Enzyme design. Sequence first.
Site, short mmCIF file in Angstrom:
data_model
loop_
_atom_site.label_atom_id
_atom_site.label_comp_id
_atom_site.label_asym_id
_atom_site.label_seq_id
_atom_site.Cartn_x
_atom_site.Cartn_y
_atom_site.Cartn_z
N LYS A 274 28.45 26.27 33.73
CA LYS A 274 29.71 26.93 34.05
C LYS A 274 30.50 26.15 35.08
CE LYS A 274 27.34 30.37 35.30
NZ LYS A 274 26.04 29.81 34.88
N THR A 275 29.83 25.63 36.12
CA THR A 275 30.51 24.83 37.13
C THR A 275 31.00 23.50 36.55
OG1 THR A 275 29.16 25.85 38.85
CG2 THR A 275 30.21 23.76 39.40
N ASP B 83 34.61 28.74 42.59
CA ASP B 83 33.35 28.42 41.94
C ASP B 83 32.20 29.23 42.50
OD1 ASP B 83 31.61 26.60 40.27
OD2 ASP B 83 30.82 26.20 42.29
N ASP B 84 31.34 29.71 41.59
CA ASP B 84 30.07 30.36 41.89
C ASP B 84 30.29 31.61 42.74
OD1 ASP B 84 27.39 30.86 41.82
OD2 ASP B 84 26.77 29.05 42.89
N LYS C 245 45.37 38.80 42.49
CA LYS C 245 46.64 39.43 42.17
C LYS C 245 47.78 38.99 43.07
CE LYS C 245 45.13 43.59 42.61
NZ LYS C 245 43.69 43.31 42.79
N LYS D 79 21.66 22.91 32.18
CA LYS D 79 21.22 22.29 33.42
C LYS D 79 19.70 22.29 33.49
CE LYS D 79 21.63 22.30 38.41
NZ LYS D 79 22.13 22.97 39.64
N1 LIG Z 1 28.21 19.76 27.62
C1 LIG Z 1 27.92 20.22 28.86
N2 LIG Z 1 28.36 21.42 29.28
C2 LIG Z 1 28.08 21.88 30.51
N3 LIG Z 1 27.36 21.20 31.42
C3 LIG Z 1 26.85 19.99 31.13
C4 LIG Z 1 27.12 19.42 29.80
N4 LIG Z 1 26.52 18.22 29.76
C5 LIG Z 1 25.92 18.04 30.96
N5 LIG Z 1 26.13 19.09 31.78
C6 LIG Z 1 25.58 19.17 33.16
O1 LIG Z 1 25.61 20.48 33.73
C7 LIG Z 1 25.54 20.30 35.14
C8 LIG Z 1 26.17 21.42 35.94
O2 LIG Z 1 25.87 22.71 35.44
P1 LIG Z 1 26.34 23.92 36.37
O3 LIG Z 1 26.52 23.36 37.75
O4 LIG Z 1 27.49 24.63 35.72
O5 LIG Z 1 25.13 24.97 36.38
P2 LIG Z 1 25.44 26.39 37.05
O6 LIG Z 1 25.54 27.41 35.95
O7 LIG Z 1 26.57 26.22 38.04
O8 LIG Z 1 24.08 26.64 37.87
P3 LIG Z 1 23.84 28.03 38.62
O9 LIG Z 1 23.74 29.04 37.50
O10 LIG Z 1 22.56 27.81 39.37
O11 LIG Z 1 25.07 28.18 39.48
C9 LIG Z 1 26.27 19.01 35.43
O12 LIG Z 1 25.49 18.20 36.32
C10 LIG Z 1 26.38 18.30 34.10
O13 LIG Z 1 25.78 17.03 34.24
N1 LIG Z 2 57.88 50.64 33.14
C1 LIG Z 2 57.37 49.85 34.11
N2 LIG Z 2 57.12 50.33 35.34
C2 LIG Z 2 56.61 49.54 36.30
N3 LIG Z 2 56.31 48.25 36.14
C3 LIG Z 2 56.50 47.63 34.95
C4 LIG Z 2 57.05 48.43 33.85
N4 LIG Z 2 57.16 47.62 32.79
C5 LIG Z 2 56.71 46.41 33.17
N5 LIG Z 2 56.31 46.41 34.45
C6 LIG Z 2 55.78 45.20 35.13
O1 LIG Z 2 54.38 45.31 35.39
C7 LIG Z 2 54.06 44.38 36.42
C8 LIG Z 2 52.87 44.85 37.25
O2 LIG Z 2 53.23 46.02 37.96
P1 LIG Z 2 52.28 46.59 39.12
O3 LIG Z 2 51.86 45.46 40.03
O4 LIG Z 2 53.01 47.76 39.71
O5 LIG Z 2 50.97 47.09 38.32
P2 LIG Z 2 49.81 47.95 39.04
O6 LIG Z 2 49.20 48.87 38.01
O7 LIG Z 2 50.33 48.57 40.31
O8 LIG Z 2 48.72 46.85 39.42
P3 LIG Z 2 47.75 47.16 40.65
O9 LIG Z 2 47.41 48.61 40.46
O10 LIG Z 2 46.59 46.22 40.44
O11 LIG Z 2 48.59 46.85 41.86
C9 LIG Z 2 55.32 44.21 37.26
O12 LIG Z 2 55.64 42.83 37.38
C10 LIG Z 2 56.41 44.91 36.48
O13 LIG Z 2 57.53 44.05 36.32
#
Ligand SMILES: Nc1ncnc2c1ncn2[C@@H]1O[C@H](COP(=O)(O)OP(=O)(O)OP(=O)(O)O)[C@@H](O)[C@H]1O
Ligand SMILES: Nc1ncnc2c1ncn2[C@@H]1O[C@H](COP(=O)(O)OP(=O)(O)OP(=O)(O)O)[C@@H](O)[C@H]1O
Lengths: 520, 520, 154
Positions: free
Chosen positions: A334-335, A388-389, A416, A493
């Site tokens: 994932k990283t 990350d992580d 947000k 990994k």
């Molecule tokens: N195709 C591939 N996709 C993903 N990772 C790869 C691939 N080929 C090699 N890797 C190796 O995966 C390694 C890193 O994996 P990663 O750091 O994402 O594990 P992680 O999920 O973060 O570990 P943890 O779950 O402990 O956090 C890199 O060192 C890279 O060399």
């Molecule tokens: N009828 C509507 N009323 C209010 N907002 C709207 C409407 N239609 C579209 N939007 C858009 O939705 C977007 C998100 O609105 P808002 O941040 O109020 O959501 P929220 O539910 O309050 O999110 P959170 O609860 O995580 O703050 C805004 O950018 C706004 O322009």
Amino acid sequence: EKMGIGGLDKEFSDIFRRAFASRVFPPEIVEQMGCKHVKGILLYGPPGCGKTLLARQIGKMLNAREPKVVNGPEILNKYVGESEANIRKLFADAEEEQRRLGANSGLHIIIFDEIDAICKQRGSMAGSTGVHDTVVNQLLSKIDGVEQLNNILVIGMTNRPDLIDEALLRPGRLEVKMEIGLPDEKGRLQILHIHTARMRGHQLLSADVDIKELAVETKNFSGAELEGLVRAAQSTAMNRHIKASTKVEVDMEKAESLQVTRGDFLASLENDIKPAFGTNQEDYASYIMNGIIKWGDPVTRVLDDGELLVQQTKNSDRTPLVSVLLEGPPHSGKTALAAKIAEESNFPFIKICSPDKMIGFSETAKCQAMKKIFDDAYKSQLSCVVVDDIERLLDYVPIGPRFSNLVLQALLVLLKKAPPQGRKLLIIGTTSRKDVLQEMEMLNAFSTTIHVPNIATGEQLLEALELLGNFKDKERTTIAQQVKGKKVWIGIKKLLMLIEMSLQMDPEYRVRKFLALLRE
Amino acid sequence: EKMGIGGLDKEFSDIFRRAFASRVFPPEIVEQMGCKHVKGILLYGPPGCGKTLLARQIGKMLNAREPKVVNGPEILNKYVGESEANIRKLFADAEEEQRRLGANSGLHIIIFDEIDAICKQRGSMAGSTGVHDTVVNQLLSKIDGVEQLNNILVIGMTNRPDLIDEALLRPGRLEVKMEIGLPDEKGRLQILHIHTARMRGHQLLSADVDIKELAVETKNFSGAELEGLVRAAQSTAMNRHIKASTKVEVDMEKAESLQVTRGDFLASLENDIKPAFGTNQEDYASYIMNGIIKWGDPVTRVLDDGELLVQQTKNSDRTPLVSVLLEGPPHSGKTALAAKIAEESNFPFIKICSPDKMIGFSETAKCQAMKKIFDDAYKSQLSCVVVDDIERLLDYVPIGPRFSNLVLQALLVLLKKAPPQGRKLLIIGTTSRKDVLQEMEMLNAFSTTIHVPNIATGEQLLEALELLGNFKDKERTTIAQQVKGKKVWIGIKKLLMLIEMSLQMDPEYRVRKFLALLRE
Amino acid sequence: VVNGPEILNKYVGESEANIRKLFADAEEEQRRLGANSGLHIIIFDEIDAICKQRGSMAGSTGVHDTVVNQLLSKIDGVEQLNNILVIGMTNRPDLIDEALLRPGRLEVKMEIGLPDEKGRLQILHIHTARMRGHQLLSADVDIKELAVETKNFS
Ligand SMILES: Nc1ncnc2c1ncn2[C@@H]1O[C@H](COP(=O)(O)OP(=O)(O)OP(=O)(O)O)[C@@H](O)[C@H]1O
Ligand SMILES: Nc1ncnc2c1ncn2[C@@H]1O[C@H](COP(=O)(O)OP(=O)(O)OP(=O)(O)O)[C@@H](O)[C@H]1O
Ligand SMILES: Nc1ncnc2c1ncn2[C@@H]1O[C@H](COP(=O)(O)OP(=O)(O)OP(=O)(O)O)[C@@H](O)[C@H]1O
Ligand SMILES: Nc1ncnc2c1ncn2[C@@H]1O[C@H](COP(=O)(O)OP(=O)(O)OP(=O)(O)O)[C@@H](O)[C@H]1O
């Protein structure tokens, strides 16, 4: 145009306006409409953007014939009485030429090469209780009461913006603050050409020196940092010549003095690597150690959904803030896949917020060093931040379960918190625990979640071993007799950890060692 | 009476009560019945607020006829002894009229320019032993011991209210509070007409220029920036008169004298941006990011019940504190509709207590940033405070569940604490977790809750899509013909997430991808 | 008269020197005649702020651990063997130091309670005796009648 300043087209024209265009050119509206002209310019910026190089050269455009550069603490090095005396002898020769010749040259240039050494009054109202504050206000009394309705120009420059007091940042004292930032791609092609002007007119060096190809590979660092690429480059061409023949010293003009190649530059940014900052240049091979192989058909289907969603960041106007999640089992990659999607955007600010640089920090300082990364992504246009992580920034552990609630509520909000107007931001998140984040209401904050599974089939398990190239084809056929017809499920990994544990055995014992370790 | 100056309309009685109202009527029974005099007024304000044109008039309020000006820093250049004798140039000026005639209006007010420079009072004595404070211990003697029978008024004035001397806060010394705010609409346009009259060109400037055309766009900052506004604009005339003509090397009078056009002030508020201040509304468009479309009847139910409650806040006697709560599922437009109800109320003080400006704060700092908002709501007559996203202020997470009690107790009080008499306060709250706020005993404290639901039908879904305008009718028929008679339940902010992700895809697979997104 | 919290406003070093300054001005008046004035009165406007001793050991890593000293062992050991009189006063009287309430140091109480309505009559007669030196202003303002609608305050 002059001695070279590149990448400041919108900024050297900005100081055309405020100080340079008035009080000299027309001059009929100056003598019809009785005007107050500006007193000087304050120069923001990171170190290495030519704040001195403006003031070294702004006293060398109209050939005013009087440059007056004082140094930063150069005034203060006398005792009392004479401490105040230097600035009132610094302005004095231009104040004396405010004469019966009141206008008309008009001694312009007064340069403070780093003015925050003197002019603090920082707000904590302290610091030697004013041997400087008797030359702060003595500087201020020389420009207002008595008035210098003159041609003078107090160009002081600094690195710390806020620590100079706003009683000196009022429009009567100094109004024109100007952020002189590090240049962009277009700014860096302007500025490689200046230092490579004389070498361009030297011998047509090797014609593979492409300053457009050097603009793109040098993606972050600023002007003085960019000159330091050249001073090592033409020095690399010297020890191409001055030590290959003999030791210290002998050889002198033995090979018809040689040429700066492209191979000198690419070794000059292996040493020095360091851009300083290091924003977008972490050298992320620590995050991608063994490449990104296409071991599975879902692997392309992970990183396309990155760039299917990176284009949402580059183009949209409805959604300015994108928060994706790369989840899955641990050791699944994932990283690594988070760094690749962050690299394939080619954004001008790619920062990997990762807990390997935040260890030992308390519950509070992880919030500040996450605020700082999410500040410097607001100060751009397109930027990707890999949060990350997740279960280490949240420093989660399933006994109790405990986690920093100070960080979590500084991380549910930054998913947000939109950037300022017209700006974009991509947030890539990695976690091994979807169900933990399901409780804390973080899946509500993340926009969409990309699943990174493990290997699924033995046919994926063979293909994961094909591209690495560690076993022979007869050895893979033995594995194909084993892992075909079975259920296997292991991270990539971990799958690199297994092969290197298996290759340390004797050649008759490596395959049976790998089958034992894969069995778990 | 007053010289065209206002803002403090409740303070124009205060000079006619205690300080200025005395020392006129007997004046020989003031010593027979010991009404102690006041010796000075202290004046607060931002840098560039403007006080001198009021200070020359506050003696003309008394018809003083000798207001003389001593500056802050200009008295502080001469040495000790001499500086304490030059303040006796201007205090024995009023003490020679403290003659054998011990009454009949001894000599009048001395004007200060800056008490920020003279009076500091840190308690430092380390380096020139605070020579700024060594003139005031002589100058506090000149107002008291030996006291004066003069009608002077020591007009203290600062740009930083911290370093006025706390040992000078004595009732015999300067003791009364006086904040002076920004210049209003009429105060800014007349001084624009002061500068444009001298900088006339023909009458004020060239055409398409008016001081009220500037007043409807420059309504924020102080006076010194406003002089620098025209000073940038006559330098933006130097963008126009010479720089819009040609480069640096302009000729002599061939541009036909080409003075200020429109804008040259729009650019002066944008390149460079010069508010410098502080404090005005920012930004109700940063929370209404994509507008407020009206996708049906539940949008109407928010706005009508809000404004009938806004009529309750403006026009009540029994209820000085009205507290309303908005609710519903997340991503359902709760943050925006609370800002929509406040912005249409046309109240003077509309500020948003928001969680996304409090990231990384402690529990104490969330309670002092919330009182600092609610203290400034206690100063205007009508004021609506949008208190957005309660469970991020209460930093709530349902594991444990852990929440900051200290914020909850700095919030359960303020939903029941009325402002002083005559001043009303509206408070709007938004929350995603309604029942969690019930368990903390807070629906006990709200007066009413106005529900904000998700979209219910495909007719309401398409009405949310007909107002955004993103799709072809054949596709909108296909979007109709899938959910025709089926139930959909999703927020409006999530609807902006799904539609924008669907726009990035190829048109062969945009709608079918959207039909897979809307399923969850 | 020295103020209470004015004695503490510095860093470490001067808040121990200011509590020697107001005694060395008395100790230098202990001239070749060792008795006989003898610079008597030192007014602490609020001794509560000096000998605070709240228990939390805060306040500039214990500056209230280091500013009791010249109140404790400058008047006693070595003694200013005079008729001098440290007249202290306070508003939070319980949390003064126990080492200060010793028969060598400031040793005896003075409870000044808020005054009775007879005592409120006596103070109104003082600051209307200058009103009586005007014209008495009403011929019916009676300070005994004004003392009725003030029942508690000082
Ligand atoms: N195709 C591939 N996709 C993903 N990772 C790869 C691939 N080929 C090699 N890797 C190796 O995966 C390694 C890193 O994996 P990663 O750091 O994402 O594990 P992680 O999920 O973060 O570990 P943890 O779950 O402990 O956090 C890199 O060192 C890279 O060399
Ligand atoms: N009828 C509507 N009323 C209010 N907002 C709207 C409407 N239609 C579209 N939007 C858009 O939705 C977007 C998100 O609105 P808002 O941040 O109020 O959501 P929220 O539910 O309050 O999110 P959170 O609860 O995580 O703050 C805004 O950018 C706004 O322009
Ligand atoms: N934009 C630029 N173009 C060309 N050369 C530059 C540029 N910026 C810096 N340099 C090189 O750096 C030197 C001065 O750098 P610069 O003025 O950035 O330092 P500075 O900003 O004055 O330092 P400080 O931040 O302490 O004030 C010059 O000699 C020049 O060779
Ligand atoms: N809204 C307002 N309320 C009260 N007074 C105002 C207001 N607007 C403007 N004024 C008056 O405008 C004056 C500002 O004038 P101006 O900026 O020309 O000179 P000044 O800044 O006072 O002079 P100096 O630069 O010496 O301080 C103030 O003295 C003030 O009395």
